[PDB]
Amino acid sequence: ANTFLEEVRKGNLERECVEETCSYEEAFEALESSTATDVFWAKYTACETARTPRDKLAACLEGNCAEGLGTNYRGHVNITRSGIECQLWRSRYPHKPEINSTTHPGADLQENF
């Protein structure tokens, strides 16, 4: 955002929307891949507490750790705290989830992760 003459130089997704509080416009401009754009947005949002420092935002981009209540987690662990198998979020077996893939598509709902 700062260093006004940045909009004439080429840019770095990391030298605009990472090491600096950025516009989703410059984010949109730099991303275009609107799926990953939503991903980066989701990042930003969850990383709202990971805005600083820089390496914290880098880790929040890695996504292996759940931020706060766990909106950002994108790992491969699909097991409950006590070893019970996780039911498919979209499937109705054995429970029909009021809160499921249709209601939360932006969390990247995997098989049972």
Q: Does 64 bind other proteins (CB under 8 A)?
A: no
Q: What single letter denotes the amino acid at residue 57? A: L
* DSSP per-residue codes, 14-67: HHHTTSS---HHHHHHHH--HHHHHHHHHHHHHGGG--SSHHHHHHHHH--S--
Q: Which CB atom, from 17 or from 89, has the smaller least distance to Ca ion?
A: 17
Q: Does 3 bind other proteins (CB under 8 A)?
A: yes
Q: Which CB atom, from 5 or from 84, has the smaller least distance to other proteins?
A: 5
**Hey, which residues between 4 and 23 contact other proteins (CB under 8 A)?**
4-5
- Nearest approach in angstroms of CB 51 to other proteins is 15
4 interface partner picked from other proteins, Ca ion, none, CB below 5 to 8 A per type: other proteins
29: left (phi over 0), alpha (psi -120 to 50) or beta: alpha
Q: What single letter denotes the amino acid at residue 103? A: T
- Nearest approach in angstroms of CB 16 to other proteins is 15
**Which residues, in sequence order, are CB contacts of 68 under 8 Å at separation 6+?**
46, 49
Which residues of the shown chain bind Ca ion in the complex (CB under 5 A)?
1-3, 6-7, 11, 26, 29
Which residues of the shown chain bind other proteins in the complex (CB under 8 A)?
2-5
